[PDB]
Homo-oligomer: A and B are copies of this chain.
Amino acid sequence: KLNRVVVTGYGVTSPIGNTPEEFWNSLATGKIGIGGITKFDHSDFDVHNAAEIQDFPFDKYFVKKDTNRFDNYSLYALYAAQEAVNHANLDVEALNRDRFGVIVASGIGGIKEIEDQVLRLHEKGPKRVKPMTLPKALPNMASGNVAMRFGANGVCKSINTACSSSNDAIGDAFRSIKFGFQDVMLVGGTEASITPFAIAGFQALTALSTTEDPTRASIPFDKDRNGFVMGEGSGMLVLESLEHAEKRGATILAEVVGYGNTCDAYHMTSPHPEGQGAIKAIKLALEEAEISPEQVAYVNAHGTSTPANEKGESGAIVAVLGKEVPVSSTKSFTGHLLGAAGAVEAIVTIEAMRHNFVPMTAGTSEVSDYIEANVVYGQGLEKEIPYAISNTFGFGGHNAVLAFKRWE
């Protein structure tokens, strides 16, 4: 009747690494990816840092034409998805392609393309807008491109819950396999919104840190936090039914056991001040997984480094899980990957379970006095992690929590 759901591989491009080995190395050792902005001229901006991918392995899978067929938002998903397929030793050729699906979340899609073609419209007129603008820009197209690359004829969609997009995507694929609609899913998220428009937009909202020191801008839970630092990239996971994974002899890396999604229905960008909605989302994940709060050995926080977010998030972790469970935010390393956050953080959490190590929150040196969660900083912590959760809480009130079980 119900299926267990297993992770058999994943792939990633991020500001701290473009392979599994490099990614985990950064997390284990403490190599951050925040630095000065180089993708555009930022002299008139108040923000001067971001977590860029400054070594994208374009030549591994793409040729020169591909920089024009695809916006970066699609390029990152495609790279990560191929890496995930390779990592899983998945042979696309031997699958029932009708039971093989794709979900690629994105917050904003090909925003660089939109911005550039809008400007070109106003200055040269409509006969001059490029024919593939919308195929490259629309937020659903990455998922279609991934489906085309691997002949996935099953489910194909995108999901948008802003910062929660990837968490909900994985939860959705999770539910899809658990209830027998698919046997294999490539799922995750991608974002490439380090652009003048997207940065100006979050700057106008006051959500971005203006701190000049790149070692001090993304400091989740810290006393002196003053906004997030935008990152970019993609993470993609291969999920399978346990049955399907075991019937081809896959190496199983981990298991997805719980998913909870709620809505603050409070305010458009401001999170609930005591994390009321987050509280319910964590409980729903634990309930589906049928575990108790005490079994949660690690929490990968949303932890964006905003004054309001960590107040309520700490408050919510404490009310459900207590003040002993280790908590860290890797947005201190990767920046805030927006719609890709969840995907990359699911990988962080899976790697943490496999390597018996809670990565630290980088940069953070002193936590606010009202924050009661056991925020890990200064150095990560060695321990057994049988179960873990990863939080995301987007603009528009979207709360999403994933619960994972270590594979034994």
Contacts and interface: CB of A to CB of B under 8 A. Distances in A.
Contacts of A202: 134
Given A107-B138, A129-B201, A132-B205, A160 B161 contact: no
Contact of A45 (B126, B139, B140, B267): B126
B114 A118 contact: yes
A207 B316 CA distance: 49
Contact of A152 (B98, B204, B263): B263
Given A102-B263, A135-B268, A140 B153 contact: no
A269 interface: yes
Contacts of A138: 107-108, 160, 162, 395-396
B107 A147 contact: no
Scoring A108, A132, A153, A264 by chain B CB atoms within 10 A of each residue's CB, the highest score goes to: A153
A168 B162 contact: no
Interface in A101-136: 101-102, 107-109, 114-115, 117-119, 121-122, 125-127, 129-135
A119 B197 CA distance: 10
Given A45-B126, A101-B263, A262-B153, A398 B140 contact: yes
Contacts of A137: 201
B144 A263 contact: yes
A6 to B, nearest CB: 20
A157 interface: yes
Given A44-B127, A139-B160, 6 more contacts: A109-B160, A114-B118, A141-B268, A148-B268, A153-B265, A155-B261
